[PDB]
Amino acid sequence: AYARTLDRAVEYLLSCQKDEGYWWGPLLSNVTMEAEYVLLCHILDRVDRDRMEKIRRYLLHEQREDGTWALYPGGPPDLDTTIEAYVALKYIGMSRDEEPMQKALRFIQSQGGIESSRVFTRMWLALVGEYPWEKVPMVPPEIMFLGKRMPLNIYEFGSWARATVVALSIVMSRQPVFPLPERARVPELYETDVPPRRRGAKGGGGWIFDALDRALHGYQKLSVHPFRRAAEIRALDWLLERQAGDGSWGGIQPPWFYALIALKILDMTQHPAFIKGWEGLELYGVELDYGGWMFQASISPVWDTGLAVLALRAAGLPADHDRLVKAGEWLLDRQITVPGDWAVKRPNLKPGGFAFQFDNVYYPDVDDTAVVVWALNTLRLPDERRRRDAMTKGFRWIVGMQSSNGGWGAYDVDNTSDLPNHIPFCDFGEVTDPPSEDVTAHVLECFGSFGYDDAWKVIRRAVEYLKREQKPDGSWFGRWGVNYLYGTGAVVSALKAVGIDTREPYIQKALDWVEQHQNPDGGWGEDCRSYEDPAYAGKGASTPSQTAWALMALIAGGRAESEAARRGVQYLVETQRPDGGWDEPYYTGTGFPGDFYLGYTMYRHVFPTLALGRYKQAI
Amino acid sequence: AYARTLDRAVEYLLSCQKDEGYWWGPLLSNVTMEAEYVLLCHILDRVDRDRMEKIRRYLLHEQREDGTWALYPGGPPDLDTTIEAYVALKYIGMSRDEEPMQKALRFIQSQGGIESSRVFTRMWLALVGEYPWEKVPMVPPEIMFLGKRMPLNIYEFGSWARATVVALSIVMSRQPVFPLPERARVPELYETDVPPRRRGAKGGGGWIFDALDRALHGYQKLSVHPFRRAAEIRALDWLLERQAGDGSWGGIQPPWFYALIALKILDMTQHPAFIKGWEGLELYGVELDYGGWMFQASISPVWDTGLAVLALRAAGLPADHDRLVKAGEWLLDRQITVPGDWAVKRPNLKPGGFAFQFDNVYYPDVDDTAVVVWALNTLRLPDERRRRDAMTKGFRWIVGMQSSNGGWGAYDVDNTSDLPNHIPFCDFGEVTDPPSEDVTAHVLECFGSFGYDDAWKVIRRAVEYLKREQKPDGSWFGRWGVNYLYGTGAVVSALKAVGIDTREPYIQKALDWVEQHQNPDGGWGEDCRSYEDPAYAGKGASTPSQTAWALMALIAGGRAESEAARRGVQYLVETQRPDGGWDEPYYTGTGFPGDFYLGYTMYRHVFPTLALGRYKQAI
Numbered sequence A, B: 001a002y003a004r005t006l007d008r009a010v011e012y013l014l015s016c017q018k019d020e021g022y023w024w025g026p027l028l029s030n031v032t033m034e035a036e037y038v039l040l041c042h043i044l045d046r047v048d049r050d051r052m053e054k055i056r057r058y059l060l061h062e063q064r065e066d067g068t069w070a071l072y073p074g075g076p077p078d079l080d081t082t083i084e085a086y087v088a089l090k091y092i093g094m095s096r097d098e099e100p101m102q103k104a105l106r107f108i109q110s111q112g113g114i115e116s117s118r119v120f121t122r123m124w125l126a127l128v129g130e131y132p133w134e135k136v137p138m139v140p141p142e143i144m145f146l147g148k149r150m151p152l153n154i155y156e157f158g159s160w161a162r163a164t165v166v167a168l169s170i171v172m173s174r175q176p177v178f179p180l181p182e183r184a185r186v187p188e189l190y191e192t193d194v195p196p197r198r199r200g201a202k203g204g205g206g207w208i209f210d211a212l213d214r215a216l217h218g219y220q221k222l223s224v225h226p227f228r229r230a231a232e233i234r235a236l237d238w239l240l241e242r243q244a245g246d247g248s249w250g251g252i253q254p255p256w257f258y259a260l261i262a263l264k265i266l267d268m269t270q271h272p273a274f275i276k277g278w279e280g281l282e283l284y285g286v287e288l289d290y291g292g293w294m295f296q297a298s299i300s301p302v303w304d305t306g307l308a309v310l311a312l313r314a315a316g317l318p319a320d321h322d323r324l325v326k327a328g329e330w331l332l333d334r335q336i337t338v339p340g341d342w343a344v345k346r347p348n349l350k351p352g353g354f355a356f357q358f359d360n361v362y363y364p365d366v367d368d369t370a371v372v373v374w375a376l377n378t379l380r381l382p383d384e385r386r387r388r389d390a391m392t393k394g395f396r397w398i399v400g401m402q403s404s405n406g407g408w409g410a411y412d413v414d415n416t417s418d419l420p421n422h423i424p425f426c427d428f429g430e431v432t433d434p435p436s437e438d439v440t441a442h443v444l445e446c447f448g449s450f451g452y453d454d455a456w457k458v459i460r461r462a463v464e465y466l467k468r469e470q471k472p473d474g475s476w477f478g479r480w481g482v483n484y485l486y487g488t489g490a491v492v493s494a495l496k497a498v499g500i501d502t503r504e505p506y507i508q509k510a511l512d513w514v515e516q517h518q519n520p521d522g523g524w525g526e527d528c529r530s531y532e533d534p535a536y537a538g539k540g541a542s543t544p545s546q547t548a549w550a551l552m553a554l555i556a557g558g559r560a561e562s563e564a565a566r567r568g569v570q571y572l573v574e575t576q577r578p579d580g581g582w583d584e585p586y587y588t589g590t591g592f593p594g595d596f597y598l599g600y601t602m603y604r605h606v607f608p609t610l611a612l613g614r615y616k617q618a619i
């Protein structure tokens, strides 16, 4: 049935490994990354024309026959994304009367033009002089004076939003304008009959923050701003302190680009932080085969590496396999040894976490730390000692990063304030980082590998948390992977890993949910529409990664002998490519529910390998 | 008499020019640079063995037959320098039983050993666990809380000392120890029957500061220190904000090394500031022909380039000579347009200065700026508006930088506080940057090149300053070049340049002083012993550079046809090498009067060329 399939998948996965020992696939998102990169180059006056032409080719390739762009493959047309792409194409050279532009425009106009678009988009236009800064919600540098136990202070925001806010607090302080060339100006994006379609803050429009915003814009027009410089210096210092080793801020595109703009308008282009921040960008760019270029929203080598190790061990390679040892020794050198922003909440907790990217010491996340400690537990490394020390250190850091709920968030403990999702600025994505089902499940899986179970109180409060968040139909949500399949799969595997008897009715209603959502081709799929439509829960075109997750839920509950598992295994057998991998033209990653989706290009290979491995061991 | 000499000197100077258009000769000092680099490597745990063997070769090469090291070629044995060399050599692998080490030891013990050494030397030993931190004068991080009108605030210190103090405020706060290997310890440096020779604070016996020091040391022993952390963050932020583009702090060895140690003990070796600061060190290293390696205290490319332009122009190379045009265009790109520490005194003055190094935007100096603006004024470049622009900004920046007494210091306005000199940390070098005669002279020559004279009040006040500072024998002191020959040559040139009547009695006295110090070989020389011994005033083995400066005085003062001047030119003619250059085995540069001397390796070529050129013009 599957032995040849596994032999081949294992062979393919091994062939993807880099010489230094890690795995790293590109992380796909949407064209605002490259659209914004083009405007960044304009702002910094560093436009490489060959790079621009590659981006043009990339943007045209991602444009559907509609003339629109989306957040995900097969996704509905997205207005913000389409505006940004249109604008970047005009700047590069596309005339507006060319078919691909005429189409994109017509759509932009049917959605209410620029006024319907998100803050970020209107702010990028404002930076190049195509939208008034007066109508851009204001993040003032004086946010830096708010103390650690005060409302809207920067440590109430989640890690990704924080760094964005600090950098933009400098940019918005100054309201800088870098005029486009006359021919690239885009007045046509206002010319519409549809009145604005105004989204506000992610939860809703509360009047207090609307008024604060109007007061802050009033404050802007005065010539004297007492303590403003001191606030700007606080913002700058916060950024200088936290720049990552790769030059980025947070290993993610938004605060990186905004920090570079902040440094530019502070006349700091000769400062080493700027020089490194600019030069570091190439690491995240990817030359595409068809002649395009893209920029990665973030980079995923630690995550890909920990999973490849776990897949290859499940599938049957030994603990001391030479390429797994090279990987394990690589992962040891990645452990973070210094306090990050998480230490605001846990000032006496010893560092031992892991980040997602190569070098991002101030922002380790619990997911990567869980998967890496686990992976290293499956291994036998010639540095016997520093391997135990490493797991010890990681283990204990995850223990300490547990939130009050019982569950774990990604970066912080108790990052659960409701206040940030009500300022006008925050109309896109999550802006806090509360506990999630999936990372909790993953630390539970980690802990279970060390032989720990429900007797220990840490796991108890973890199991309870999950039970409280189980959905009424029996599924679990996917915060960072799509979606009910991703979370339900993670959770059941974890419940099994930590000794919980899987014949209990809550886990039987879970396994029934998975078994009941099997596609007629034998696999499972789940579309990104699932974050905004109940009808789409566990519904989509089958993908290899999501099939894997359902298969692993079934196997964890002792349903390997079941027809469902056997139909899912055969599906993996039958859709495998000649080379041992699987195609996956749909995103199964989540950045923000409803607003930002990710294609982890390695999921299609690693996860089927892991799943099939769990099948082999179960029989 | 001199034509071939000049033609060959011009050809030789031109052969020394880099392809890119600048000149740059190594800057020589003393072995504490490398001895401290060795200890730095030990502290960071980054010891390159090949590098260590080259440093050992260098240390041994520089050691005199008596076992000692000195501050300058032919100088008296220097205790501090000899101690640091002995320590580095023992670390690298020499045994105390070996003969070079025995002689050094004997000298060290004869001076009272380590208890007789300067604070820096005791501090380096404390850093490696060979001297008690308890006995090292304390620079507390709380200095960062002193505002700019408070005594001992960091802006009362000279720029070199300021950065040193900020970095060491972090270091001393933690009193970190990085023990030497057991075989490298140096207890034998305390074994003496000669009492401690305690040369304390540079200025004298301020009991207030000795009491404050004992109190800070007592404070150090308590376990809670309110606001200390906030003070350390201030110091860190100050350093991060000011790191130069080459990775250094201030383009000089001390704050660079201390900033790296500071970053290390804050567990910040993965921070990009550390990474760039560490990697940037290689630019300052120089591989020597006999297999040694040295580290430059600073680097002089702007200064060497400005001076080469002025010398070549004086020799008769045209203003639009393609190699001078290369050099002028390169100089234009070096101008600094951002605020530096100087803006603390001058917050509304437009940036326009030049630094000494390649990239040091926060620390332009008045000497480089005057010389570069002057040099640009002798050139005709194809971007003539950019040249005029640059000269205007630079000219006006110098004007705004004039101190209250009419002279100019190197980096700051009115850096004249008498307080920094009396604290027990400050027992080495100058720690403030008050106006000096040589920088003022250079400013005046720059101004005179544009046709300004003592109808302008700025020049009148500067000339009055120079008159008050003239010594009883008619000479002027040389703050940055050695010594009375340097200052007198600069000042007489300058006074001629701004239209003073050189027949005035005070100038004629200076000119007679120059004549009466001519050596019997026709040259002039002045040993660095001059700063500490009145018997060496204008006296020393003849050098090409110091002969050039004496000649420049004589020519500026109307005596080009004097016997003295003819003999000086003949000395230069007769001592030139076949290749067009001159040998100069003595230092003629000054870091700090009495304590730190400099070998500007281009002076021996550039200054003879300038003086011969001016001589040709006169005749």
Ligand SMILES: CC(C)=CCC/C(C)=C/CC/C(C)=C/CC/C=C(\C)CC/C=C(\C)CCCN(C)C
Pocket: A160, A161, A162, A164, A251, A252, A253, A254, A297, A298, A303, A356, A365, A367, A368, A410, A428, A429, A430, A431, A480, A481, A590, A591, A592, A596
């Ligand atoms: C104010 C706001 C919202 C600013 C952000 C705007 C914006 C466009 C963000 C897009 C980029 C983005 C998804 C940022 C959030 C952080 C997400 C990533 C690092 C991707 C990798 C995810 C993690 C390691 C969390 C754990 C996930 N597991 C590894 C499975």
Ligand SMILES: CC(C)=CCC/C(C)=C/CC/C(C)=C/CC/C=C(\C)CC/C=C(\C)CCCN(C)C
Pocket: B160, B161, B164, B251, B252, B253, B254, B297, B298, B303, B356, B365, B367, B368, B410, B428, B429, B430, B431, B480, B590, B591, B592, B596
């Ligand atoms: C607290 C204290 C004293 C710390 C410093 C200790 C120490 C060992 C210093 C050695 C290095 C040193 C001499 C630093 C002072 C700054 C000197 C230089 C940049 C060399 C070039 C000089 C200048 C541009 C000033 C202008 C002079 N002209 C260019 C001709």
Ligand SMILES: CCCCCCCCOCCOCCOCCOCCO
Pocket: A241, A242, A339, A340, A341, A342, A343, A344, A362, B233, B236, B266, B268
């Ligand atoms: C309270 C002002 C910000 C504190 C910055 C800490 C500076 C230490 O330097 C190392 C850089 O670390 C970057 C941030 O590290 C997180 C430590 O938590 C600080 C929370 O106050």
Ligand SMILES: CCCCCCCCOCCOCCOCCOCCO
Pocket: B138, B139, B140, B142, B143, B145, B146, B152, B227, B230, B423, B425
């Ligand atoms: C938000 C935190 C603000 C807290 C302010 C702290 C109170 C200020 O403390 C001033 C202490 O001053 C001591 C100065 O230290 C001596 C300097 O020594 C000079 C070198 O020898």
Ligand SMILES: CCCCCCCCOCCOCCOCCOCCO
Pocket: A233, A268, B241, B242, B339, B340, B341, B342, B343, B344, B362
């Ligand atoms: C305590 C804050 C002092 C202001 C520091 C300036 C912050 C901006 O940094 C840009 C690089 O600045 C290097 C230093 O520039 C000196 C400007 O004068 C500031 C004197 O407070």
